[model samples]
Target chain A: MTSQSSVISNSCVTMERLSHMMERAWCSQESALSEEEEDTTRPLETVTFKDVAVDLTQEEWEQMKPAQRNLYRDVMLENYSNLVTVGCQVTKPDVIFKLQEEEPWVMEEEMFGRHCP
Target chain B: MTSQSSVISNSCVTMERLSHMMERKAWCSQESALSEEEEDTTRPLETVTFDVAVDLTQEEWEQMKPAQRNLYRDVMLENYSNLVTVGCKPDVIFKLEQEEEPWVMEEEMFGRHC
Candidate 1:
């Protein structure tokens, strides 16, 4: 299970907030893609996709291909990490996202601070 | 299986192409969401979600909640429609999207053309 972080304060954001952002992002992306096609002389391809809803049972999720399954975890890891850090007062996820490092760095930071920015 | 039309050429913009575009689009979308939250005084909510990946058999997809199930059909009909006409030798979905009309129009246009 995702370790639910403490209730965020300064950012007043939570995973739910991030999820909302994602939905809004999809809306905006669709609008932009449509507008872009109009300006270009070349025809654009139709893009069809939507956020995978989580109502599925674990078995159903497991049935999906890896790419499909990863959507929940990885749709936007970098962004999510960033959002958590900036949105949450502590900024844990964001820092991890920015450094693009792995657990060692996360641990090193746990023992220390951001090394050399 | 989707209704396979004649093989398209000029635009090479097939539904498959659109699907690829959607995936790349998701990447760009995620990046932008993070940047915006930084400057604002308010902490941003972690905007988490992914495109509903669809490898599910129809029965399984149906089992999902309505919001969950619509992923495949509704993802971006407007842009997709736009892409189809422009991408397809003959645009179908895009024209329908623009009209914002219903079956009557779809049928009306069937007799006519967009």
Candidate 2:
């Protein structure tokens, strides 16, 4: 089995790659951010609920460059690193269809405003 | 690492696939939504938590209607960039399994929810 660090590294993440993927957070490329502000912003980020309604609808889904999509799948590995909780909200307590216990749609799959179906 | 533009541009996603995915969202086989009333809702989304216990014993982890599971996983990439957060409860907090650093459940290879 791969070492934990290997798992992390094997996942497609880099300072620049992640920062760029989330670049909208920046004021401008030239505006250097204070470390403290940056730290507080993403510090131990625990994200669970994704905005399935919106994120999944935008044209960007197809527009996202191929590398970007691969990076996204790789990021799932990073989820364990931060220990984030995942949940889903159903019209009812039950899933609309028979869902696999490990379906990608499980709570852990909540992509907030980004990923949905 | 790929280029920033490349980063946001890669994940496997599409409109027809996604729209059909979300068409399950509408009241309509008739009326539909446009980019207008849709604008206000994107502002702020809530829910920093999750839910687990169901009729686990009665359900079908054995046979699922793949109606839509892949869509959610591949979609997570976009969610993170949009700055989504996924924080689990109960056993998800492994350390909380005991209430401190020593509480970590060594290897999780089975089915159990807290």
Error of 1 at A87 (Å): 46
Whole-model lDDT for model 1 versus the true structure?
0.36
Which candidate's lDDT is highest?
Answer: 2
DockQ of each: 0.01, 0.05
Native-referenced TM-scores of chain A, all candidate models: 0.23, 0.24
**Of the candidates shown, which would achieve the greatest DockQ relative to the real structure?**
2
| Chain B vs. true chain B: TM-score per candidate | 0.23, 0.25
Query: So what's the TM-score on candidate 1?
Result: 0.15
